[PDB]
Amino acid sequence: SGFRKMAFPSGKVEGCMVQVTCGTTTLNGLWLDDVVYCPRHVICTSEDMLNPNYEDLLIRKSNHNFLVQAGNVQLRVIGHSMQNCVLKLKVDTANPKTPKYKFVRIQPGQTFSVLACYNGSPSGVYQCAMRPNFTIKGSFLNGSCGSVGFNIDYDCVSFCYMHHMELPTGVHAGTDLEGNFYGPFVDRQTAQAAGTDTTITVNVLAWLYAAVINGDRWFLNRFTTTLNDFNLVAMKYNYEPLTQDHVDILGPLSAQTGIAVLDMCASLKELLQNGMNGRTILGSALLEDEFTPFDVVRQCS
Amino acid sequence: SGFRKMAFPSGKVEGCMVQVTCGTTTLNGLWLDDVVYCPRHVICTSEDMLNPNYEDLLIRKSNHNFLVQAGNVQLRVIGHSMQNCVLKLKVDTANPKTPKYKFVRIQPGQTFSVLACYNGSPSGVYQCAMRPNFTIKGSFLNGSCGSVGFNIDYDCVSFCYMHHMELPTGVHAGTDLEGNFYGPFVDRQTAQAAGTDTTITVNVLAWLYAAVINGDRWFLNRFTTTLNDFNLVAMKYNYEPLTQDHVDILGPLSAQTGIAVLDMCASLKELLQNGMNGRTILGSALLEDEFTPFDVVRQCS
Numbered sequence: 001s002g003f004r005k006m007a008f009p010s011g012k013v014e015g016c017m018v019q020v021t022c023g024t025t026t027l028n029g030l031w032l033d034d035v036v037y038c039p040r041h042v043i044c045t046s047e048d049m050l051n052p053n054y055e056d057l058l059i060r061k062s063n064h065n066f067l068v069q070a071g072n073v074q075l076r077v078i079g080h081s082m083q084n085c086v087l088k089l090k091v092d093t094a095n096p097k098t099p100k101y102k103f104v105r106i107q108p109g110q111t112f113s114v115l116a117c118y119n120g121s122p123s124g125v126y127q128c129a130m131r132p133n134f135t136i137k138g139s140f141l142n143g144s145c146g147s148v149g150f151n152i153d154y155d156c157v158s159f160c161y162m163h164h165m166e167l168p169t170g171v172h173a174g175t176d177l178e179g180n181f182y183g184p185f186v187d188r189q190t191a192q193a194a195g196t197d198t199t200i201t202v203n204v205l206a207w208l209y210a211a212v213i214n215g216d217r218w219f220l221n222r223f224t225t226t227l228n229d230f231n232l233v234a235m236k237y238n239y240e241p242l243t244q245d246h247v248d249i250l251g252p253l254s255a256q257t258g259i260a261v262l263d264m265c266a267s268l269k270e271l272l273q274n275g276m277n278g279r280t281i282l283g284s285a286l287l288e289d290e291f292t293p294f295d296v297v298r299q300c301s
Numbered sequence: 302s303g304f305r306k307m308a309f310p311s312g313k314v315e316g317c318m319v320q321v322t323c324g325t326t327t328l329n330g331l332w333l334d335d336v337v338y339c340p341r342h343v344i345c346t347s348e349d350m351l352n353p354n355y356e357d358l359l360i361r362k363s364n365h366n367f368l369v370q371a372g373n374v375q376l377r378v379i380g381h382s383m384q385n386c387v388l389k390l391k392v393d394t395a396n397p398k399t400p401k402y403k404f405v406r407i408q409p410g411q412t413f414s415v416l417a418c419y420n421g422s423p424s425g426v427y428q429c430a431m432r433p434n435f436t437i438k439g440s441f442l443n444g445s446c447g448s449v450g451f452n453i454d455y456d457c458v459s460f461c462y463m464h465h466m467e468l469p470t471g472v473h474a475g476t477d478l479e480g481n482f483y484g485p486f487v488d489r490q491t492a493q494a495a496g497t498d499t500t501i502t503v504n505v506l507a508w509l510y511a512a513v514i515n516g517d518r519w520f521l522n523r524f525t526t527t528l529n530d531f532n533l534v535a536m537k538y539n540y541e542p543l544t545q546d547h548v549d550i551l552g553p554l555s556a557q558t559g560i561a562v563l564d565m566c567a568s569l570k571e572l573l574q575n576g577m578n579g580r581t582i583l584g585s586a587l588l589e590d591e592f593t594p595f596d597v598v599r600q601c602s
């Protein structure tokens with residue numbers, strides 16, 4: 001029993017983290033086989049931040065201009081390349097601790113574990129979600145660029161996020177590991193801000209199932225609803241629409257609990273309209289939307 | 302910026318986890334140097350659970366009765382000993398991945414990271430707190446006994462918890478690594494239940510400081526209070542008393558924010574009396590008590 005914001009074990013990723021310096025800028029890198037991946041803005045100075053031309057900034061750069069440090073052992077950079085917003089630094093040594101890995105891009109609503117790192121040193125791990133507005137509500141201080149987000153499937157590490165910057169609301173923005181930003185954000189100094197966010201409905205439903213699985217059933221009702229009528233109320237509360245594919249995905253959880261998906265949609269509608277009346281669900285006084293249906297099955301089974 | 306329930310990286314501990322079988326009971330063990338630590342109830346059967354005599358149950362046991370599996374590599378058990386509620390299994394091989402470690406016992410109010418494991422395999426990591434009633438609100442399923450809780454200090458792993466059982470409220474109980482239970486719980490079948498819990502006041506204060514550090518200041522007031530008058534209100538709300546040593550510990554945070562500790566006690570008193578009026582603090586609609594003052598300084602600095 002119990003329900004916690006549970007991250008993946010981070011050992012496999014800890015062994016890939018290195019420090020990357022270029023100029024006076026130091027950040028983190030990800031060392032897999034004989035390549036080190038890092039944010040390309042490592043090559044920038046305060047001057048070139050309003051209108052950087054990274055193609056120009058990188059052509060004026062040489063290999064010896066990059067210091068890579070795996071702990072104390074310095075790795076020799078024998079090649080440099082830019083892939084979108086990431087820099088790829090070819091090193092003389094293949095990481096002996098390279099796990100079986102994959103570079104995957106995730107969808108808004110999907111979750112991942114973050115290994116916050118500073119100077120190539122792992123500091124902490126936490127679970128995060130890609131918000132509908134393509135930002136993440138992370139925990140990051142100056143020096144954390146290059147920290148990675150990831151999921152573990154079997155023995156395979158699916159890297160999905162590399163950290164680049166903090167937006168004005170205190171939220172975070174970054175790229176997949178191929179260097180392509182999540183959301184409409186750029187690695188240059190601008191007045192960029194996160195757009196309006198919504199609630200990840202299918203996740204709130206997954207979390208209500210987790211609650212029931214844990215014996216919290218006070219919010220349950222005998223009523224049911226149609227997907228259409230549910231969606232008509234959800235949108236008034238800034239919730240994303242629920243699709244048939246979302247109800248199909250919640251099928252295992254519905255079977256394990258004996259509560260139909262549209263039954264649980266009816267309970268949600270009432271919670272939205274009446275609130276919780278000073279009660280809590282799984283230790284929370286608001287509706288949690290950063291657990292996917294998979295996250296629940298994984299922790300509750 | 303940001304504030305998350307952040308665990309320690311778990312790599313150092315992942316490399317210590319093994320599987321322990323005795324009879325048809327399989328659970329997890331912790332392998333450090335040439336010793337494997339695990340819950341002693343591994344040696345029990347359903348029959349001997351109402352009145353087990355572990356001294357008798359272990360004398361009738363032989364070394365070959367214990368199968369230890371580090372992944373696929375079986376480790377040969379050359380010795381067995383009981384230390385309070387833990388079993389120590391001397392093995393022929395010293396764990397090459399043993400980190401610098403220490404066995405420490407923690408206090409109610411202190412936090413730690415949990416590496417939930419099943420069949421010796423790390424499944425997930427999460428932050429937990431030792432409650433005032435000596436229980437933890439963990440996340441654990443059948444098969445998780447022997448999972449460990451720990452803190453990392455520099456490069457040293459301070460092990461503080463080994464998981465033994467689930468209580469009826471869905472909360473968890475266990476031992477330090479010397480086999481001594483946290484709280485008045487025993488490793489035998491009884492109607493044992495968690496006693497009444499309280500809120501960890503100094504932690505709620507630490508978390509309010511984290512909020513201010515993150516730009517959430519709506520709950521702040523110009524009023525201040527005395528430690529006595531604050532404690533007189535807190536106890537009405539089932540909060541633990543605040544001591545001078547607690548205010549001294551919150552000194553760094555008070556200095557960094559310019560909010561006196563008793564100023565922040567005044568804000569807390571008002572939150573307790575009026576509630577939050579539909580507002581949130583660091584993404585929460587209730588007052589969070591599972592972050593210590595150290596946890597805040599570590600994540601916010």
Ligand SMILES: O=C(c1cncc2ccccc12)N1CCC2(CC1)OCc1ccc(Cl)cc12
Pocket residue numbers: 041049140141142143144145164165166186187188189302
């Ligand atoms: O290291 C940080 C940072 C990262 N995350 C959270 C933070 C919170 C407070 C202060 C710093 C951080 N930088 C350094 C690099 C950064 C973002 C902040 O500056 C200017 C800039 C321009 C373009 C990019 Cl593409 C990244 C940056």
Ligand SMILES: O=C(c1cncc2ccccc12)N1CCC2(CC1)OCc1ccc(Cl)cc12
Pocket residue numbers: 001342350441442443444445446465466467487488489490
């Ligand atoms: O494996 C679990 C377990 C651990 N934690 C959470 C759980 C939630 C649901 C079901 C099981 C678990 N056992 C097995 C060993 C256990 C506790 C539950 O049974 C009887 C017993 C007697 C004494 C002890 Cl000292 C431990 C046990």
